[PDB]
């Protein structure tokens, strides 16, 4: 059964801290606790160890990532920027 209408995972905070802040932290709370698919083994086991550290329980691999998401948009863009600059560097 659906137990909450909108609070979702930030229902742990009860009435405290304000609706807007609770709404804001909800998006991060979901993401930092999701299990991402591992690129190295494919099993959905990638999980946050600390802030910025993501570990896979299957292949045991650890990856430096975003604070609340496996990879940040800023980093993803830079990887394509560095890939592009590499080619022109050696044509």
């Amino acid at each position: 059964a659906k137990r909450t209408k909108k609070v979702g995972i930030v229902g742990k905070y009860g009435t405290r801290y304000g609706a807007s802040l609770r709404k804001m932290v909800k998006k991060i709370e979901i993401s930092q606790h999701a299990k991402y698919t591992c690129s190295f083994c494919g099993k959905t086991k990638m999980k946050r160890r600390a802030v910025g550290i993501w570990h896979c329980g299957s292949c045991m691999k650890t990856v430096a990532g975003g604070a609340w998401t496996y990879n940040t948009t800023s980093a993803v863009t830079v990887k394509s920027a560095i890939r592009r600059l590499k080619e022109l560097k050696d044509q």
Partner: protein, 248 residues
């Protein structure tokens, strides 16, 4: 009056860094023949959490080129590196995330982190989580490069300075509301004795320029001159302006 809190911070005492459980200082390799003329290979053994630091640290192992030894270095983790990866450092490493190259060989617009302020100091710029510096331009005749720092300042540095390709890991950390005094208590219990903070107007005149009064008011302008003596330099120190920053 008595010595104000700000003055008392510079004496150490209860105001020294909480370094009991820190993993060590994070640096690039000391520059040697391998990095000056070629490159050297290492392997990412583990990516670890450093207390009091947002960014994770990478434990990269190299071979000692003169002795039968393994050298363990503690790098600032570039976002996207992983354990078992190979990283390379030197004048002739490839342009890949995590490699360490002199900025002089990096093409224009390269995003770099843990950049050397002065050649050979093993990294001083853009080390906080998520940050990065950028390469603007090179001047091969003067052997110099122009980088853009996270603060937005443009600095001229020697081309021989090394850096790590990519941005620092753990970005976006400041996007989460702390929501709780207790969560901030734990944030600084790993950093230093700086929390919670008591307002100047909340004290007595004996221990603060802004203290005292039948109303909690500053009473005097809060923009203080640059050369104000210690114990008087409180409020907005040498402010060029004040108020809301409307417009660019």
């Amino acid at each position: 009056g008595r010595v104000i809190r700000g003055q008392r911070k510079g004496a150490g005492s209860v105001f020294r860094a909480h370094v009991k459980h820190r993993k060590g200082a994070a640096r690039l390799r000391a520059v040697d023949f391998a990095e000056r003329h070629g490159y050297i290979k290492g392997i990412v053994k583990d990516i670890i959490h450093d207390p009091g630091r947002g960014a994770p640290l990478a434990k990269v192992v190299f071979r000692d080129p003169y002795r039968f030894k393994k050298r363990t270095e503690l790098f600032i983790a570039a976002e996207g590196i992983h354990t078992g990866q190979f990283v390379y450092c030197g004048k002739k490493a490839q342009l890949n995330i995590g490699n360490v190259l002199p900025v002089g060989t990096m093409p224009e617009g390269t995003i770099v982190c843990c950049l050397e302020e002065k050649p050979g100091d093993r990294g001083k710029l853009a080390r906080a989580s998520g940050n990065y510096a950028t390469v603007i331009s090179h001047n091969p005749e003067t052997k110099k490069t122009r980088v853009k720092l996270p603060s937005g300042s443009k600095k001229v540095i020697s081309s021989a300075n090394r850096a790590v390709v990519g941005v620092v890991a753990g970005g976006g950390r400041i996007d989460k509301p702390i929501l709780k005094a207790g969560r901030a208590y734990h944030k600084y219990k790993a950093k230093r004795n700086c929390w919670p903070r008591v307002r100047g107007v909340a004290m007595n005149p004996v221990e603060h320029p802004f203290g005292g009064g039948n109303h909690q008011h500053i009473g005097k302008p809060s923009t203080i001159r640059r050369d104000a003596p210690a114990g008087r330099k409180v409020g907005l120190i040498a402010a060029r302006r004040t108020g809301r920053l409307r417009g660019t």
